[PDB]
């Protein structure tokens, strides 16, 4: 059940009556029992335990909380500045933090350089001429 319940136990929180229809989906896991010898670690680490350390993080988000601590001081120095919290630190720190740079600026300015500029610009180019 582990492979499917990972996709279900998150949905099962709002599928109490729909347990009786996802329980039939649970046995699709027992097909991969032989694979589960080496697929049990990522069976739960596929949707919900993968969005904590494996895919959502892959450890990258672990530090992305850690930095903002000291940064809060410069923010709060202008934050205790009731006339500068929305004008300066909210209007400059969060403008590139709200919607834009969530998945392409994971360092100062380089996450786009090595992945987006680096490979996401060049991943198609890798094969799309050779094949």
């Amino acid at each position: 059940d582990a492979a499917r319940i990972s996709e279900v136990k998150a949905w099962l929180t709002s599928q109490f009556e729909a347990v009786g229809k996802e329980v039939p989906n649970f046995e699709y896991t027992h097909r991969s029992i032989t694979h589960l010898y080496n697929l049990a670690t990522a069976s739960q680490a596929k949707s919900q335990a993968a969005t904590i350390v494996a895919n959502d993080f892959r450890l990258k988000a672990s530090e992305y909380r850690a930095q903002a601590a000291r940064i809060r001081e410069i923010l709060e120095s202008a934050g205790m500045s009731q006339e500068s919290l929305p004008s300066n630190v909210v209007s400059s720190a969060q403008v590139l933090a709200n919607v834009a740079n969530l998945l392409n600026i994971r360092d100062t300015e380089l996450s786009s350089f090595l992945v987006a500029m680096g490979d996401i610009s060049l991943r198609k180019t890798g094969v799309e001429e050779k094949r």
């Binding site: 892959r58 450890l59 530090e63 350089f113």
Partner: protein
């Protein structure tokens, strides 16, 4: 105290340097700056940083995936490429089916 200060006075003054990179300070969160934003950061530590700096040699014999699978999933493509390798798998066989 002096024995402690010989091993503690450096600590407090130094630890303000990892204040912002406290992830780099703490063990369970230094990996992002040593693995995740590191497919080029590990170049100076090339011997140490084989995580993704060695992906080029890892695909040295895989010349299709040379400039494609080298530094992609290190930050953002570990969630998007995987969904599109099964369509590749099922369409490359259609490129094998043209031979068929």
């Amino acid at each position: 105290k002096e024995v402690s200060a010989f091993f503690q006075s450096p600590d407090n003054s130094l630890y303000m340097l990892p204040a912002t990179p406290q992830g780099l300070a703490r063990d369970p969160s230094a990996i992002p700056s040593i693995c995740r934003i590191s497919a080029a950061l590990q170049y100076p530590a090339g011997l140490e940083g084989s995580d993704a700096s060695l992906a080029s040699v890892l695909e040295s014999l895989e010349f299709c995936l040379r400039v494609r699978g080298s530094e992609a999933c290190v930050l953002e493509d570990l969630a998007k490429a995987i969904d599109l390798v099964h369509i590749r798998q099922d369409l490359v066989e259609s490129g094998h089916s043209l031979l068929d």
